[PDB]
Amino acid sequence: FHKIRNEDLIFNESLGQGTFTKIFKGVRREVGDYGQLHETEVLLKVLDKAHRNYSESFFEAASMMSKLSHKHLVLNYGVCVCGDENILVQEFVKFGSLDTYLKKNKNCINILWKLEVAKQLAAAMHFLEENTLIHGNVCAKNILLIREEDRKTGNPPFIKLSDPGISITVLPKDILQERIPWVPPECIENPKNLNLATDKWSFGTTLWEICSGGDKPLSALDSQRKLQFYEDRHQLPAPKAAELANLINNCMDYEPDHRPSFRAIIRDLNSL
Numbered sequence: 001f002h003k004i005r006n007e008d009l010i011f012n013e014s015l016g017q018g019t020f021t022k023i024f025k026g027v028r029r030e031v032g033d034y035g036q037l038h039e040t041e042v043l044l045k046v047l048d049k050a051h052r053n054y055s056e057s058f059f060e061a062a063s064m065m066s067k068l069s070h071k072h073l074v075l076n077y078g079v080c081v082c083g084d085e086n087i088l089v090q091e092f093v094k095f096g097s098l099d100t101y102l103k104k105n106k107n108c109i110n111i112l113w114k115l116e117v118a119k120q121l122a123a124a125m126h127f128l129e130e131n132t133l134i135h136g137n138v139c140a141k142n143i144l145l146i147r148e149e150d151r152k153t154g155n156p157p158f159i160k161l162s163d164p165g166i167s168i169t170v171l172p173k174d175i176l177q178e179r180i181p182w183v184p185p186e187c188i189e190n191p192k193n194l195n196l197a198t199d200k201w202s203f204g205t206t207l208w209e210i211c212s213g214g215d216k217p218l219s220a221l222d223s224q225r226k227l228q229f230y231e232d233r234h235q236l237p238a239p240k241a242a243e244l245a246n247l248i249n250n251c252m253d254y255e256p257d258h259r260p261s262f263r264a265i266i267r268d269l270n271s272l
């Protein structure tokens with residue numbers, strides 16, 4: 001990673017939290033192209049000091065995204081570890097996380113918008129699959145909206161997939177159960193069962209989020225009931241706008257070997 005000086009970073013408003021992390025908007029003073037000074041908006045992810053033991057995992061996640069370059073992957077500017085702090089410095093995406101955006105804009109997000117955003121996420125996951133890189137935490141909160149749909153231009157929305165945060169392979173089991181149904185059944189059984197097929201399951205759950213106006217599947221169920229949901233081999237209910245329901249269910253296959261490749265997922269999406 002590129003090491004960024006603390007003096008060059010300015011923390012501003014809190015933009016929420018991740019697992020064991022606080023997220024902030026920030027400003028980075030930098031020498032840009034042609035040597036001109038800029039103040040660039042950045043996103044700052046701070047690992048909680050009480051959870052500093054996850055430092056490695058915390059950075060590994062983002063490191064995984066940094067070794068590949070792709071239009072649908074969020075950019076990492078680097079890290080600030082000068083001091084007790086563990087700071088990750090990423091690009092600031094203007095319109096924030098997709099789950100929030102889907103909630104706030106639900107009244108005017110239609111089927112074509114959902115299909116375009118699903119195609120983009122599928123394309124990003126296909127890039128990862130082709131590179132045999134496991135994301136491990138595909139969810140609508142980890143999708144960021146770079147630009148909104150502009151029907152006057154014909155411009156579609158454009159999304160980027162963010163880093164997965166601290167790996168489910170090292171997280172406490174109660175946090176893993178709270179993350180049902182994003183975390184696949186096999187990973188509840190064994191978190192070290194982290195595979196490429198994991199991302200197909202989680203992509204299905206994310207599609208459900210995208211089609212459900214930002215609702216959280218199974219949120220009414222506590223941890224015991226989410227566990228039982230997997231034990232009883234249930235599927236999520238079809239969204240009211242059910243045009244993606246079969247794809248959601250084909251991705252959320254309890255048999256990981258039977259989950260479709262992202263090429264087949266993309267061919268389905270195009271067929272819709």
Ligand SMILES: CN1C(=O)c2sccc2N(C)c2nc(Nc3ccc(S(N)(=O)=O)cc3)ncc21
Nearest residue numbers: 015043090091092093094095096097141142162
């Ligand atoms: C880089 N990045 C992330 O990795 C993740 S992963 C899960 C959440 C994020 N976050 C917080 C982000 N929010 C943003 N920009 C942004 C813009 C507007 C708003 S809002 N809804 O307050 O107006 C929030 C975040 N830009 C980028 C991110």
